[PDB]
Design a protein around this ligand. Sequence first.
Ligand code: GDE
Length: 470
Amino acid sequence: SMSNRLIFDADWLVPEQVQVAGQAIQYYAARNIQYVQHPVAAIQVLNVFVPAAYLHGSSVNGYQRATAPILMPNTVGGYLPGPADDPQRVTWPTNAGTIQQALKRGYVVVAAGIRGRTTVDKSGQRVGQAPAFIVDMKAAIRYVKYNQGRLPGDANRIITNGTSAGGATSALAGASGNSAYFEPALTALGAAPATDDIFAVSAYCPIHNLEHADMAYEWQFNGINDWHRYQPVAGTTKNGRPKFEPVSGQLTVEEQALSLALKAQFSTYLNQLKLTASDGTHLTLNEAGMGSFRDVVRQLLISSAQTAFDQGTDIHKYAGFVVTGNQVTDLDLSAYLKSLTRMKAVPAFDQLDLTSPENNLFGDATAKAKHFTALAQTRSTVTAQLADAELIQAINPLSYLTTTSSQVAKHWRIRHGAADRDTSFAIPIILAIMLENHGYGIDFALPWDIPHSGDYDLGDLFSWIDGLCQ
Ligand SMILES: O=C(O)c1cc(O)c(O)c(O)c1
């Protein structure tokens, strides 16, 4: 209710500690803060964790109470609900380890709970489908910025972080600062009266640009007709993590035919983005999907391999690399992708029977799931409607670089593992190039043999943050 003034009180902070690399890290915690006045789901609370020094007038890693970066990680995966995280949390999902390391680094951490596609209200109604995830992230950001000074840390140094769907969340927050599209939703929640633009973005394998991901997936994997992914088994770990196991399949003749069309359409989509290299050349693909853009993907994988090679890693785990002397001189991309293996079938994102996480994400209070591409709606195997075009646009980070309607974070660090096949490499690469093209700071790479995952390079992430903030 409006009795919730959304005013943070440092008096709420209580002392705790956690071991990191065999040493005690002292911090203060305040949990379960209702960050909007009119929440519709119990998950909509946030936790605040502060390096202990900041409650005693001292410094950590060059930062003080007033100047410390504010890291805002999320636990969103598969566009499911992401509970408020905690350095003490052991239940799945969690990035507790990252919070612990962040505190050691001197960052204030504000970990918000975020609704997801399965979130229902007290009456069992669905209230977490798009764009709930990003509304909640923005509401938490507004809570933080509204409470500048009261909350330890610099509210002008908010850095979001997340993996996969959570990476898309982080990227979207960075791209869509103060967009008018979300104002109605935020007003309805009674979010704090403040801005929601942020300082920097960290994103691991952001699963985004969903309405073009099917074309990108087939551009990449056409010609590879076996797929290998996971399905759930009964039971969880003691900490609630769902159990999985490998299951393979083979594309049908019909899927193979559909793949070829999706692949062909990608060339036009890609070309019409008008992406450029550093020297300014238009990056493109021809009718058969070859060209300068394809060469960029290849080069990024060669760079990834060289970095691993120099560390003594055997890059011939995967096929296609040409090593001359101690230099990775070339790559047969098709061969690499074949050894890497296709994970998803066709279409990979907009499934014709509405069964994908993305389909459910684009459902609403009436329909459990929707299509979000013309192709899938046309080819639908079940009764279905297309999601609202503006909504699709609104939750795509790219939209804010290509049609200005927001304030964009100046600093971006994006990673997508060289072994990650949840989405085509073209997807994060398009984001990175578009960022660079529009003058934003972008640190991008495809780390060698890293699977679908995040937070695996914390030393480097934190050095990047410190480079921006100290
Ligand atoms: O958050 C994830 O792990 C995730 C989310 C997705 O929407 C998705 O299509 C995927 O392959 C992985």
